Amino acid sequence: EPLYENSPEFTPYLETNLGQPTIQSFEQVGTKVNVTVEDERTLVRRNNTFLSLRDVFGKDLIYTLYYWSGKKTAKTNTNEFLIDVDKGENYCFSVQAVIPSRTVNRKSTDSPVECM
Amino acid sequence: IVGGKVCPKGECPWQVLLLVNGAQLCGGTLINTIWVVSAAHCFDKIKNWRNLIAVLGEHDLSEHDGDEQSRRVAQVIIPSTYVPGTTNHDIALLRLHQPVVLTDHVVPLCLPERTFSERTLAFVRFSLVSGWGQLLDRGATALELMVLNVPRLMTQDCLQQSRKVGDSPNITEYMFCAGYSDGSKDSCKGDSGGPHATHYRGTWYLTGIVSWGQGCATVGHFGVYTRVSQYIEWLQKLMRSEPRPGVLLRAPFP
Amino acid sequence: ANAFLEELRPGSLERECKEEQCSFEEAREIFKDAERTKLFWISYSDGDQCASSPCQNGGSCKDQLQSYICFCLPAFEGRNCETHKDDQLICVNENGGCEQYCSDHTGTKRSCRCHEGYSLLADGVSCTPTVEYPCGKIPILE
Amino acid sequence: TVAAYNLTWKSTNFKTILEWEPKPVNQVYTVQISTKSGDWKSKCFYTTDTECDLTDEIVKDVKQTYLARVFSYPA
Ligand SMILES: C=Cc1ccc(-c2ccc(C(=O)NCC(C)C)cc2C(=O)O)c(C(=O)Nc2ccc(C(=N)N)cc2)c1
Ligand SMILES: *[C@@H]1O[C@H](CO)[C@@H](O)[C@H](O)[C@H]1O
């Protein structure tokens, strides 16, 4: 028998790192701003099509938004935030993927910061 | 077999029963119409090399039906390297006096090539082991052929994972571990000589022989099987060799 | 960037860290608070590890923090999609797709064989019985 | 021949890479992967590398636990 070594066990769904999110866009509707997070593709393929992180985790996945003098936060179980803002003030935004149910590797890294 | 199920009549058709003057001795495995593979240690204490019968198509030891065929064992071939009262090189090749007749109930297990076995069969996790041996370590033997699914381990993992014990023989390269274990668990006394059979892409191969264990189910212990892949060339060379005149024959290995 | 002027013009993050490319202070001339500056700086200063075009064989590169991910066309794998799956048809790889025996040949393709009592079909990998009771089949289920 | 060591899983968005030491000297590696009750599947055959992409296996079912092992052979 050849010399061999065993690896640690690995459960992808629980242990794969979440990648860096990006912000697709933001739009204004009077006092309200819509922030859309890009669906990040995974290497899971359903029939010659790469699935998104939402397609794989569904309701297990949430996105957090930091915006801004401190910081405010918003959560969404979709890819969209609808936030209230003050008129004539310019805001900056950043998002983080979170899987609350996890014990390790719960949070992605923060997205690039975008500003109005 | 401990913790196994009945093998439905016909579904373990290469199981052999060996008797010496009517008494249950060991299991065996039919590999063609005249040749049976068993364990060397099964023959250590024989001295009636003509009271030695093979039975094929057996199921229920307590009723004789039309599927049973009996044959006299003409010859028992073991390695010269085997040593009675030890565990290494624990394999026997048996020539039947007349052929068996192949039926829905009596079919050989395929002996594989060495490389196929080492490179492919070795990495199929679960294989079946079967016999009429003890249902419990203590306990009694089975009347109906019993069968069990066991997972294979590489020796490094078998050592690192077996509970350590003062006077257990070494696992050699002519052996491989079962079983896991955890007590549920395994095979047992009286199953010896019987097959460890591996399924692959629609066909069944002999990969092992029931040999020994530290008792049964074996807690912290695994079943140990003869690593058939090491003996394939030796089996093939003897199966084409010319019958010697004695019953017991020690042929050189390798 | 900052020309003779330019800078005359007050702090923008436009036309100053992005239509051009900024130093860590042009970045706090702007954000003032520093969780906030670090937060911007982490991603800004990281750079595109995908610029070196590491993904081969038609793969697409997605940028990460101090790393990347290659997405591969189906016949490829590897960190950089460097591995042709089609060149891996060797007997150690799932027995070569052979149903029974596999034979490796340097110079040429792997060839499949069958046990006594079977012969090889036309598809080149499948075995079929040439006798009534071949080894290793259970008649009462076949 | 030396056993590989420091077997490490690198995974991001299911892109899953096994890494180990050491750099091989007159020895090559083969990798095997299975589920807890499945067959061992061979990957990255006779490589001189110290990594193996296992993405294509693990994405078959992301909820399974997998075990891997690295084999050392002399050249
Ligand atoms: C290699 C030497 C060796 C020698 C004799 C015996 C032996 C001793 C006594 C009896 C017995 O009590 N009589 C009943 C029978 C004859 C009908 C039977 C056997 C036997 O051959 O199986 C065994 C032996 O127990 N093998 C064995 C096999 C598997 C496991 C397991 N997987 N746990 C544990 C043990 C091994
Ligand atoms: C392309 O650049 C990456 C990092 O940006 C490097 O790791 C690769 O070797 C190169 O081909």
Ligand SMILES: *[C@@H]1O[C@@H](C)[C@@H](O)[C@@H](O)[C@@H]1O
């Ligand atoms: C990025 O993804 C890979 C898989 C290919 O489809 C490329 O053409 C695409 O741009």
Ligand SMILES: [Ca+2]
């Ligand atoms: Ca009977």
Ligand SMILES: [Ca+2]
């Ligand atoms: Ca400028």
Ligand SMILES: [Ca+2]
């Ligand atoms: Ca400037």
Ligand SMILES: [Ca+2]
């Ligand atoms: Ca601009």
Ligand SMILES: [Ca+2]
């Ligand atoms: Ca400019």
Ligand SMILES: [Ca+2]
């Ligand atoms: Ca400054």
Ligand SMILES: [Ca+2]
């Ligand atoms: Ca400036």
Ligand SMILES: [Ca+2]
């Ligand atoms: Ca300045």
Ligand SMILES: [Ca+2]
């Ligand atoms: Ca980057």
